[PDB]
Amino acid sequence: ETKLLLIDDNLDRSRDLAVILNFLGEDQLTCNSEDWREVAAGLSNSREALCVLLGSVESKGGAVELLKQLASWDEYLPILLIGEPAPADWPEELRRRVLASLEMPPSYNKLLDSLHRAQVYREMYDLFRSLVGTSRAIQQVRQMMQQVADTDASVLILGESGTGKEVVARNLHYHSKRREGPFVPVNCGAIPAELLESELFGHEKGAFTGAITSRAGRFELANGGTLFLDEIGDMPLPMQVKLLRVLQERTFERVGSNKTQNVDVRIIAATHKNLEKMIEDGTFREDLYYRLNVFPIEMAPLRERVEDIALLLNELISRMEHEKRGSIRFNSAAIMSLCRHDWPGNVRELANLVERLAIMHPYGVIGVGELPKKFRH
Amino acid sequence: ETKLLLIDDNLDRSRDLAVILNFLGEDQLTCNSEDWREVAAGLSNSREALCVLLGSVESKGGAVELLKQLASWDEYLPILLIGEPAPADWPEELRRRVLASLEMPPSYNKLLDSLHRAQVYREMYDQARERGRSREPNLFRSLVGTSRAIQQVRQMMQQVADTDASVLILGESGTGKEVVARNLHYHSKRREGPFVPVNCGAIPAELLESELFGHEKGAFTGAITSRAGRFELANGGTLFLDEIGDMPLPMQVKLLRVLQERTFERVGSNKTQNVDVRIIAATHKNLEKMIEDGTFREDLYYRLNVFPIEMAPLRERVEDIALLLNELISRMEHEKRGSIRFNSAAIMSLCRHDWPGNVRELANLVERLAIMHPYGVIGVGELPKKFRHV
Amino acid sequence: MHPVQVIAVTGGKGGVGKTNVSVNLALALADLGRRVMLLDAALGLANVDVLLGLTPKRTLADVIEGRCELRDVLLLGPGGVRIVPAASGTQSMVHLSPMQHAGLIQAFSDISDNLDVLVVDTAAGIGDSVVSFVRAAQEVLLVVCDEPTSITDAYALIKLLNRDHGMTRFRVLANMAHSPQEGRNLFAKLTKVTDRFLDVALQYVGVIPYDESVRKAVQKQRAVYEAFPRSKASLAFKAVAQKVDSWPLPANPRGHLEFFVERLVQHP
Numbered sequence A: 001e002t003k004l005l006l007i008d009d010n011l012d013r014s015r016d017l018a019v020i021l022n023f024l025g026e027d028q029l030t031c032n033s034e035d036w037r038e039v040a041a042g043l044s045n046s047r048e049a050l051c052v053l054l055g056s057v058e059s060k061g062g063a064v065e066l067l068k069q070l071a072s073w074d075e076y077l078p079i080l081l082i083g084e085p086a087p088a089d090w091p092e093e094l095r096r097r098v099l100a101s102l103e104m105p106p107s108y109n110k111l112l113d114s115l116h117r118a119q120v121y122r123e124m125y126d127l128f129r130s131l132v133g134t135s136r137a138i139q140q141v142r143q144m145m146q147q148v149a150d151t152d153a154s155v156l157i158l159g160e161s162g163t164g165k166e167v168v169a170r171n172l173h174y175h176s177k178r179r180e181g182p183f184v185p186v187n188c189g190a191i192p193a194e195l196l197e198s199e200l201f202g203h204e205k206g207a208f209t210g211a212i213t214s215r216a217g218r219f220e221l222a223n224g225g226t227l228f229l230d231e232i233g234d235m236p237l238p239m240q241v242k243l244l245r246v247l248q249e250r251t252f253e254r255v256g257s258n259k260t261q262n263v264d265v266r267i268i269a270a271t272h273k274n275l276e277k278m279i280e281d282g283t284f285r286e287d288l289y290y291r292l293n294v295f296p297i298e299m300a301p302l303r304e305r306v307e308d309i310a311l312l313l314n315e316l317i318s319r320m321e322h323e324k325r326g327s328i329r330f331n332s333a334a335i336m337s338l339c340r341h342d343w344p345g346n347v348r349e350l351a352n353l354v355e356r357l358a359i360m361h362p363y364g365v366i367g368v369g370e371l372p373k374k375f376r377h
Numbered sequence B: 001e002t003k004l005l006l007i008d009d010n011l012d013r014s015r016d017l018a019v020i021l022n023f024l025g026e027d028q029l030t031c032n033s034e035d036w037r038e039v040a041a042g043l044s045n046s047r048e049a050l051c052v053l054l055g056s057v058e059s060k061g062g063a064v065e066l067l068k069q070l071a072s073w074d075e076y077l078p079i080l081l082i083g084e085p086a087p088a089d090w091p092e093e094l095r096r097r098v099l100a101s102l103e104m105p106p107s108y109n110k111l112l113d114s115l116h117r118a119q120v121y122r123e124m125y126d127q128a129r130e131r132g133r134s135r136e137p138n139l140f141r142s143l144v145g146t147s148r149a150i151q152q153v154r155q156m157m158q159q160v161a162d163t164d165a166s167v168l169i170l171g172e173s174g175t176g177k178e179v180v181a182r183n184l185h186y187h188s189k190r191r192e193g194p195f196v197p198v199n200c201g202a203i204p205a206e207l208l209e210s211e212l213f214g215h216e217k218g219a220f221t222g223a224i225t226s227r228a229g230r231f232e233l234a235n236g237g238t239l240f241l242d243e244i245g246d247m248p249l250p251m252q253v254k255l256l257r258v259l260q261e262r263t264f265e266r267v268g269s270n271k272t273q274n275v276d277v278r279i280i281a282a283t284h285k286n287l288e289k290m291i292e293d294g295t296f297r298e299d300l301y302y303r304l305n306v307f308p309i310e311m312a313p314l315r316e317r318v319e320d321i322a323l324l325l326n327e328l329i330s331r332m333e334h335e336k337r338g339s340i341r342f343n344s345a346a347i348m349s350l351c352r353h354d355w356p357g358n359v360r361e362l363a364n365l366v367e368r369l370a371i372m373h374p375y376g377v378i379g380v381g382e383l384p385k386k387f388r389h390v
Numbered sequence C: 001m002h003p004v005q006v007i008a009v010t011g012g013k014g015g016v017g018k019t020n021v022s023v024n025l026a027l028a029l030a031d032l033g034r035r036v037m038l039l040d041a042a043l044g045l046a047n048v049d050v051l052l053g054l055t056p057k058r059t060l061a062d063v064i065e066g067r068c069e070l071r072d073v074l075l076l077g078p079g080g081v082r083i084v085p086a087a088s089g090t091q092s093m094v095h096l097s098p099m100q101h102a103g104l105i106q107a108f109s110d111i112s113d114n115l116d117v118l119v120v121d122t123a124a125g126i127g128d129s130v131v132s133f134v135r136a137a138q139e140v141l142l143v144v145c146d147e148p149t150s151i152t153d154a155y156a157l158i159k160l161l162n163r164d165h166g167m168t169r170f171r172v173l174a175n176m177a178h179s180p181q182e183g184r185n186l187f188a189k190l191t192k193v194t195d196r197f198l199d200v201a202l203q204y205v206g207v208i209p210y211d212e213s214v215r216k217a218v219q220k221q222r223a224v225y226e227a228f229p230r231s232k233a234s235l236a237f238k239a240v241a242q243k244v245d246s247w248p249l250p251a252n253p254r255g256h257l258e259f260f261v262e263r264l265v266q267h268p
């Protein structure tokens, strides 16, 4: 991904570090004081250079001038000395870039602590449109989604009620290899306990006192796509066991049938309950928990991302332009009043409020008194 | 104090391996295929020779004579191949004395894992002086550590490996009892027999009878077939009972009957069947406290606790976390699923964690970090908030 | 291939004209040019066939009892509307388990010709069958009359659905109103109660006037839309149907059981 530059005119120590980084799984390009410009020209940009390992230099002028044209090359490129003691007379202007002074032979600990410090300074120095906002939490969520969307792993979305978990799941599905497949949502808190097994697995012509036809379950509906199990915490324990068995074996059977079918699906589960406490109280299975918790994404409440409300309002109004139930605009005082609200059931209440005022007063403007109740104070 | 021996006739490979081991801070005596004895005599005795790293041989004779001479030097000296797959030219009983084959250049995690494997080999097979039978390595795969608890577990497994007796594994949920059961099964007289794992908590309480013992035609509403139980599938093998503590009392009486009388009954059947199985029971509940609570059978408890294995929580063997990370990351490299590297701060922060669900938590965290930060350095900042500590 | 719009006609209060609204809305939507199927969710007591003058040979009792499948009980009703008939006082249809309602709703997926209209005529009350058929429908149309009992029953149904199932969007249609101001005032009262206690979205659809042509049509056992196509009630039904055709089609499946989840999954 990112290359390393070692600048050393001492060939013995240069080979020493070269084999060490090669062993340590770090990509580097061997350079000397006179041909490093050609190597730099071979670099795609200044960003691809994580750091430079400076060693003995025999070019005219010395190490002091050598840091000058690397400084002219980039001011944000960090420097660490290899096999040279910490300076005591070099100019002070360059001592905000000497991260550490390593000695040959280097040690494993301080090499990675040096490499970690280099990554921190580089980070300090320098497309999910559905999820809008500017808080730290929202961009952390976006980064985690970017990291997990390209791989086949079980995602668990943790948060509170009405925090926007289905949107995150859909963005994960759309930016994956399964984009052309189906998206099948399953709500375990909107299906009775006796119906969940038949709904997920399907049934034959006769399996129980109500089965009148043979139909495909939602695992077979999700074949070639992702299955989004919302409210996994209220799933009954026997159904938890059967779901674990299906996930482990990759095979399932319809209710009232003995034929085994295989389905390749991606599991994205959602929860608002504290699962760990549920395993502690024995109301949830720990094995299913660790099968579903390969990658957890924690969503943040709207009361903790208050500066984001206006953008959410504009986004919600935006989507009503596509689903054709009208439009409405807001006032600055009304927006400030909404920002000063507790908001339990964050995005669900925000969308409910917008829909309610859109149907109530269409193509209007909302003031402080225009809000219905308990939203201005 | 312990030393290695690098024996390879390629000068460059010897030199760069030597400098790698100096970088890791590992003592070594560089050697060749002609003068190793002369420098090997400087060390006190054959015990300080942890292992030998043997590469390519382009000297007189084959590798067989060098292997025999090394075995003469000390019979208990593990061998690590560097950049050379093992050749298929020895008997299957004589093809297993080396521990690992390290691809060139070796990976940090795999190198450390192989060194710890050599240490585990040396610390028990050398000093034993008791096993007249040929040694059986590989019996400790997921058991890596330098704690008192893990060494006690290894001693108990070595005691029980050569005896066919019922085993009771005591440990918290997620400690890794299944791998211990598999290690006991595949390195006992049952190696060719089936290994059948059953989780009592998974089967519903009303179906545990049919699942464990099987049933015949029309045994219950829904019994269209005569499916046979787990015990008969484990005949000539091993059955692994996990969380035996939730199994109800009548089932406990029938299990004791299977253990002693070697007989059981199917559902809907009027005949007794004899099966020869080995029962390795696992639980995470205090069985004694259940006995004075009137929930577990006391006689069953005495029958099972003849060979107990107490697997300690990770929070009580925290100084083994580094080795466990090396094993997990090494497997993750072997399956081409990526690699991660920690600094000292992250490892210390992890060591100060309570770890509920010890090894499953560790593996889940490793997988999560592989997804989050692939090919990067993990510090305290990049760990999840629940793992950060001051 | 397209998603199918499902409309549940309800209201809790009996005798508010749920069946008349269902039948006349079905015929009007067929008049605009859609393939419409009408289901008589009044499973124990059938009134769609009575109002339309039909005498079905096979009904849904035959489907549940297993003598026939679901396709062969369809009847070609007036205006091209395909009717699913219900039983009238059959011991196997008086009360069904939730498993049976789930099976019947799921079995409707075998039908793949209707042009995104399926009108579901729920029974009176807030019972299990009514809730099951309302939750499975995309649109919920509540028929309310300007009486305290009707307002109370509609509010009770809304409160039940919102409290125990999280539903928040409801369509309200006024029936047997003697002036448009009567319908507006009825909507105002219902919204006043709901806002005082709940946080839900009520959308006014229209008003169906009190018209004796409806009574003559019921006496003749024919539909007011076809028997008296130029009456005030028929014109009101045509206007409502034009308004209903402008409703947004479903696009995404929800987690619970609902009609035609197959079309809501594969099409997107």
Ligand SMILES: Nc1ncnc2c1ncn2[C@@H]1O[C@H](COP(=O)(O)OP(=O)(O)CP(=O)(O)O)[C@@H](O)[C@H]1O
Residues within 6 Å of the ligand: C013, C014, C015, C016, C017, C018, C019, C020, C021, C042, C047, C123, C124, C175, C176, C177, C208, C209, C210, C211, C212, C214, C215, C218, C233
């Ligand atoms: N707008 C209107 N003008 C005149 N009569 C009307 C009317 N709407 C409904 N009615 C009358 O109401 C009576 C019942 O109608 P309908 O059978 O459709 O009600 P309903 O289905 O709600 C009763 P239930 O729910 O018990 O089946 C009939 O006499 C019908 O003609």
Ligand SMILES: [Mg+2]
Residues within 6 Å of the ligand: C018, C019, C042, C047, C121, C122, C123
């Ligand atoms: Mg009716």
